Design a protein around this ligand. Structure first.
Ligand SMILES: *CC(=O)[C@H](C)NC(=O)[C@H](Cc1ccccc1)NC(=O)OCc1ccccc1
Length: 212
């Protein structure tokens, strides 16, 4: 369980993206999750469509609300297309999955990490990236243009992102905003403080598919 875990230089995460004026956090976080695992075994890095997840997942409320843990489940159940055969537009619409044709990616299950346990988060993040939530409605996290976020912030979780590494002290997160935020679309939050919930409630509820 290395002292350092970066999947970027591991060839697991692709360039950064933006959800835009679309409250669709959840589908983006997922595509990165599934994505990671998909490349971890096969040795093939891919960019899947979040747009599809939006238009297809009726359980989620597309362009403004969702469950990073429906998306995944969805995929495993059905599947998910490339981000070319289903590029992101930013507006929820009619499911094209079927109309689009044969799927391209399809997992083999979804599991959740025991909330409120850093030790647990890491491990999984060590075996493969994960979808995690937190407080973004933040007025500080909103302004982050590079650094180690300690706060201030709260325990009112409401935005989903992704963890793509950690250090002895900083946890790495991929944001669904442009590369005109944090440190090039990236933000480092601090771990090991005692805060069980985890600063910004980053330890509330996390997840991930399964792959054979
Ligand atoms: C980040 C974003 O674009 C939208 C506005 N918010 C969400 O998708 C959240 C994700 C989340 C899940 C768990 C904990 C924190 C955030 N999802 C969401 O609010 O949908 C839930 C819901 C919406 C409307 C009515 C009932 C429940």
């Amino acid at each position: 369980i290395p002292e350092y875990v970066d999947w970027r230089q591991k060839g697991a995460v692709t360039p950064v993206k933006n959800q835009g004026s679309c409250g669709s956090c959840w589908a983006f976080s997922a595509v990165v999750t599934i994505e990671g695992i998909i490349k971890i075994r096969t040795g093939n890095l891919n960019q899947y469509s979040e747009q599809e997840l939006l238009d297809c997942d009726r359980r989620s409320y597309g362009c403004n609300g969702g469950y990073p843990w429906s998306a995944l489940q969805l995929v495993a159940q059905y599947g998910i297309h490339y981000r070319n055969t289903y590029p992101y537009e930013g507006v929820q619409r009619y499911c094209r999955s079927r109309e689009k044709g044969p799927y391209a990616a399809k997992t083999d299950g979804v599991r959740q990490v025991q909330p409120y346990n850093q030790g647990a988060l890491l491990y999984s993040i060590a075996n493969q990236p994960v979808s995690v939530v937190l407080q973004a409605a933040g007025k500080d996290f909103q302004l982050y243009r590079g650094g180690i976020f300690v706060g201030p912030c709260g325990n009112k979780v409401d935005h989903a992102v992704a963890a793509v590494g950690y250090g002895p002290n900083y946890i790495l997160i991929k944001n669904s905003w442009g590369t005109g935020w944090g440190e090039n679309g990236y933000i480092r939050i601090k771990r090991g403080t005692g805060n069980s919930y985890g600063v910004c409630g980053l330890y509330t509820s996390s997840f991930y598919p399964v792959k054979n």
